[PDB]
Amino acid sequence: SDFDLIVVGSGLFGLTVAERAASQLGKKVLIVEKRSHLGGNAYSEAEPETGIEIHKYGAHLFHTSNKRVWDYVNQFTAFTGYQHRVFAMHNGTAYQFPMGLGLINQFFGRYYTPDEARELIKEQSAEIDSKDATNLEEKAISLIGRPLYEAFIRDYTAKQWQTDPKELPAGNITRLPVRYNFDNRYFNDTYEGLPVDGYAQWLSNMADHENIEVRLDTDWFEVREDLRAQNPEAPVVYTGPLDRYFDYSEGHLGWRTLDFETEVLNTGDFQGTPVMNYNDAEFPYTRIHEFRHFHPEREDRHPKDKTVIMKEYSRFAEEGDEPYYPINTPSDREMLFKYRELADAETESGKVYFGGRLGTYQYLDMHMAIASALSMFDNKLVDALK
Amino acid sequence: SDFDLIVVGSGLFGLTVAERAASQLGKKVLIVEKRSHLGGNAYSEAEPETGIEIHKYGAHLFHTSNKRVWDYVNQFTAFTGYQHRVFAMHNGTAYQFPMGLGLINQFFGRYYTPDEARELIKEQSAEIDSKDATNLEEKAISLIGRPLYEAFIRDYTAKQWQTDPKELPAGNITRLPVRYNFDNRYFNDTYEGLPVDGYAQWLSNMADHENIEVRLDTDWFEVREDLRAQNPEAPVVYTGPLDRYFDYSEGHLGWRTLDFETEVLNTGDFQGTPVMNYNDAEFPYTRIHEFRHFHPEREDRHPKDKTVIMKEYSRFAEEGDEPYYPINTPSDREMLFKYRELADAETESGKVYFGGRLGTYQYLDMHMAIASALSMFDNKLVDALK
Ligand SMILES: Cc1cc2nc3c(=O)[nH]c(=O)nc-3n(C[C@H](O)[C@H](O)[C@H](O)COP(=O)(O)OP(=O)(O)OC[C@H]3O[C@@H](n4cnc5c(N)ncnc54)[C@H](O)[C@@H]3O)c2cc1C
Ligand SMILES: Cc1cc2nc3c(=O)[nH]c(=O)nc-3n(C[C@H](O)[C@H](O)[C@H](O)COP(=O)(O)OP(=O)(O)OC[C@H]3O[C@@H](n4cnc5c(N)ncnc54)[C@H](O)[C@@H]3O)c2cc1C
Ligand code: NA
Ligand code: NA
Ligand code: NA
Ligand code: NA
Numbered sequence: 001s002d003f004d005l006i007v008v009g010s011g012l013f014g015l016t017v018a019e020r021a022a023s024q025l026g027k028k029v030l031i032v033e034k035r036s037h038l039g040g041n042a043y044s045e046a047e048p049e050t051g052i053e054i055h056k057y058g059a060h061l062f063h064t065s066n067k068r069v070w071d072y073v074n075q076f077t078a079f080t081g082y083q084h085r086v087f088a089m090h091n092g093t094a095y096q097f098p099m100g101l102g103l104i105n106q107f108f109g110r111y112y113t114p115d116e117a118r119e120l121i122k123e124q125s126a127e128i129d130s131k132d133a134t135n136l137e138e139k140a141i142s143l144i145g146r147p148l149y150e151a152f153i154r155d156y157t158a159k160q161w162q163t164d165p166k167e168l169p170a171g172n173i174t175r176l177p178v179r180y181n182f183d184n185r186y187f188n189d190t191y192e193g194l195p196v197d198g199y200a201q202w203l204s205n206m207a208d209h210e211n212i213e214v215r216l217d218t219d220w221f222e223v224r225e226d227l228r229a230q231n232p233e234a235p236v237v238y239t240g241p242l243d244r245y246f247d248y249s250e251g252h253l254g255w256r257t258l259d260f261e262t263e264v265l266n267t268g269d270f271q272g273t274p275v276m277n278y279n280d281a282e283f284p285y286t287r288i289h290e291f292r293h294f295h296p297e298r299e300d301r302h303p304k305d306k307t308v309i310m311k312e313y314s315r316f317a318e319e320g321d322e323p324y325y326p327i328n329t330p331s332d333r334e335m336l337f338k339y340r341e342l343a344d345a346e347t348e349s350g351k352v353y354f355g356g357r358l359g360t361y362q363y364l365d366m367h368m369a370i371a372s373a374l375s376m377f378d379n380k381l382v383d384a385l386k
Numbered sequence: 387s388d389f390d391l392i393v394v395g396s397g398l399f400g401l402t403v404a405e406r407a408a409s410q411l412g413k414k415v416l417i418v419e420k421r422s423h424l425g426g427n428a429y430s431e432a433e434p435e436t437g438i439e440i441h442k443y444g445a446h447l448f449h450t451s452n453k454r455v456w457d458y459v460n461q462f463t464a465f466t467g468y469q470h471r472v473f474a475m476h477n478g479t480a481y482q483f484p485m486g487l488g489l490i491n492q493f494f495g496r497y498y499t500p501d502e503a504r505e506l507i508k509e510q511s512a513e514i515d516s517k518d519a520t521n522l523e524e525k526a527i528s529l530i531g532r533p534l535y536e537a538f539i540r541d542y543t544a545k546q547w548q549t550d551p552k553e554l555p556a557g558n559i560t561r562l563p564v565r566y567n568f569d570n571r572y573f574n575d576t577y578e579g580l581p582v583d584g585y586a587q588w589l590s591n592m593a594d595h596e597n598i599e600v601r602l603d604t605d606w607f608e609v610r611e612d613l614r615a616q617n618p619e620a621p622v623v624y625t626g627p628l629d630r631y632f633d634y635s636e637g638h639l640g641w642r643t644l645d646f647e648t649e650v651l652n653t654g655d656f657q658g659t660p661v662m663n664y665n666d667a668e669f670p671y672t673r674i675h676e677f678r679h680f681h682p683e684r685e686d687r688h689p690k691d692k693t694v695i696m697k698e699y700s701r702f703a704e705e706g707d708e709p710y711y712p713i714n715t716p717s718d719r720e721m722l723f724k725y726r727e728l729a730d731a732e733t734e735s736g737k738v739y740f741g742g743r744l745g746t747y748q749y750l751d752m753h754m755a756i757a758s759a760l761s762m763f764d765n766k767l768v769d770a771l772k
Pocket of ligand 3: 058060
């Protein structure tokens with residue numbers, strides 16, 4: 001047949017499934033993708049004026065402790081030795097971040113040793129016991145105290161969720177957000193880096209296989225009757241929206257979206273670091289990305305006197321908005337449970353498998369989507385394709 | 387014969403020459419080493435109480451942009467992804483270091499953009515033109531201004547050299563010691579890391595070859611008549627002290643030494659970072675090393691409640707002291723020129739080649755010693771061993 005497997009969506013989940021079926025089982029795979037390019041939100045591109053690699057659907061940082069996933073992605077791209085670091089702007093000062101000996105010295109005004117900092121945090125967080133916290137605000141205060149909470153967490157979180165932290169779940173903070181050393185690596189994972197030739201090249205390489213057919217600018221729901229009629233027994237891996245698949249029969253799942261404001265500025269360096277969080281309420285955006293600093297190894301290809309920056313604004317995802325993060329209200333958890341039932345029925349009657357961020361209503365980092373796709377491939381698709 | 391080449395000293399220079407002759411020319415090499423272990427000052431060892439890898443002859447950080455040298459050393463050890471970072475203690479605050487947007491924010495009290503920082507440094511350094519600087523103090527001030535100089539350079543340099551900076555050469559600072567971004571990598575080189583299994587294992591591996599014989603606890607000047615009599619036409623590569631070789635016939639070359647004070651403390655973490663500079667005069671030591679933080683990947687082998695730290699004191703190298711850094715007074719440059727003549731005569735009449743830090747009166751980093759030995763091997767020893 002012309003294809004043995006249909007994959008809807010070319011994010012990391014779709015690409016992984018498609019590539020494994022193609023290379024490991026020698027199956028013909030047809031990828032159907034609604035957008036004009038491969039890669040889902042991980043897709044990046046050159047900003048036209050400067051040539052700098054940028055993202056329109058969120059900056060993407062790769063990191064994992066899963067060696068299987070690390071070895072896998074390295075088949076398709078090399079990675080730079082980029083290590084993500086973030087600074088936090090508060091009351092006109094850029095603080096070392098996350099909270100650690102550096103921020104503590106800057107904020108409290110003198111050097112604390114690791115043991116002195118531990119004792120400081122004990123004193124600061126004395127007021128509320130974590131066991132008694134009834135919301136995010138109280139949870140934070142119970143761990144690090146009011147001064148730190150009020151400076152670095154309160155307004156930032158308010159902007160992030162468009163909600164008073166008093167009305168957010170205590171379960172949103174699960175561990176002490178403080179380090180007792182000067183380590184300011186943002187991530188804690190074994191492996192980390194950025195694709196040497198950019199995300200677009202990496203993701204294109206995943207789908208570059210003699211057994212893979214790619215149809216861009218194609219909506220599954222427009223073409224599905226025709227495609228399946230060509231080969232009815234070919235399974236489908238669906239990574240589009242779960243609720244949309246079932247015509248919103250149980251209602252609309254709730255998502256957060258982001259608005260990105262991009263500017264080309266007439267300086268070669270706007271903030272001297274890839275990401276500056278803006279922790280204060282007076283700034284409407286949560287942070288500014290300056291994209292050239294993600295790839296310092298490219299500095300002589302970057303313009304000397306121009307730079308691209310991006311500001312980020314969060315709000316509720318309405319119709320037409322890209323859905324980014326599941327909101328997960330109890331109502332959302334309710335209809336999700338109902339959609340899972342429908343989906344499972346569809347897998348049994350129609351050989352349609354549901355996966356990925358949109359397909360399962362679950363935020364997934366790149367390595368987690370890949371891991372999830374490797375699992376589905378191993379545990380479901382190998383059998384289904386025999 | 388029992389050997390074809392004698393190498394005096396087993397630092398990186400000696401090891402490199404020995405290994406190349408052994409593996410590339412199939413020559414039998416005899417290494418003669420005065421100390422009880424291989425590796426010269428790069429040698430490291432486990433501190434007995436804690437097991438932590440420490441140095442008795444200075445902490446050794448490996449870094450290079452020389453790809454030939456990088457590829458070479460990786461034949462003998464793997465390297466961790468360690469990236470050196472230093473903090474600077476001044477008036478009770480740990481500053482981000484080297485001077486950059488982080489230190490500038492901490493010191494001047496609010497955030498400066500890259501362009502604002504450039505303008506700040508222009509204003510601060512206006513007083514003295516670099517072209518007019520007559521000593522180190524004036525040179526520093528001409529580049530960064532008095533407040534920064536007085537806080538971070540003056541006393542530190544005084545301790546380092548035991549000299550008023552007014553009496554040090556303007557040529558000691560050759561470039562702007564300020565970055566206009568938040569990059570606090572201490573080194574600027576392409577490749578960097580620490581030996582995964584420690585320096586002792588790496589350096590031992592270099593000399594581990596069927597063609598290499600090692601005699602430790604052996605002073606060249608005690609055994610040389612006997613050894614050369616066994617095979618008169620075998621050349622010698624000498625990496626011991628240049629002036630000592632010629633019985634100080636032209637006087638004693640001047641060196642700086644370091645005293646290291648090591649302590650085991652009853653805490654698992656003393657300062658939360660490998661190195662803290664102490665920039666103020668009130669502290670007699672220049673900096674404190676906390677050795678466990680050089681190898682965080684070993685944290686579950688390190689003790690939970692103990693740590694080894696080391697304080698560093700600089701002074702003139704007297705008899706019995708390990709000579710570390712050439713002082714290079716004009717008098718020193720004088721007799722060095724005379725020793726170079728003697729050495730060159732000795733190479734012609736006696737087939738004794740002079741190399742390495744002690745052998746040439748020149749401080750050499752590990753990668754520079756290796757590069758220098760590779761050159762000597764390529765350009766001198768291949769011919770001499772035919
Ligand atoms: C703003 C943002 C920032 C992120 N930052 C990071 C990060 O820093 N590090 C990290 O590891 N991960 C990050 N991620 C997650 C990352 O994008 C993952 O790769 C993604 O979540 C993987 O899941 P996926 O492949 O299912 O999703 P997607 O990337 O959403 O891919 C789904 C694809 O299905 C297509 N599709 C949808 N409907 C149809 C249809 N009807 N017909 C045909 N095609 C369709 C979509 O166009 C899309 O291309 C971020 C995600 C977002 C949204
Ligand atoms: C305090 C200090 C800190 C340093 N830190 C770094 C760093 O962070 N990063 C870096 O890249 N480099 C560093 N170095 C330099 C590093 O040690 C180099 O490897 C070294 O300078 C290389 O030169 P070498 O092999 O000639 O010297 P050496 O290491 O001095 O080796 C010379 C050897 O010759 C032996 N010897 C001397 N006389 C005799 C004799 N009569 N008979 C037999 N044997 C003899 C000595 O015992 C010694 O083992 C540091 C050096 C010092 C001193
Ligand atoms: Na991201
Ligand atoms: Na508490
Ligand atoms: Na050193
Ligand atoms: Na000046």
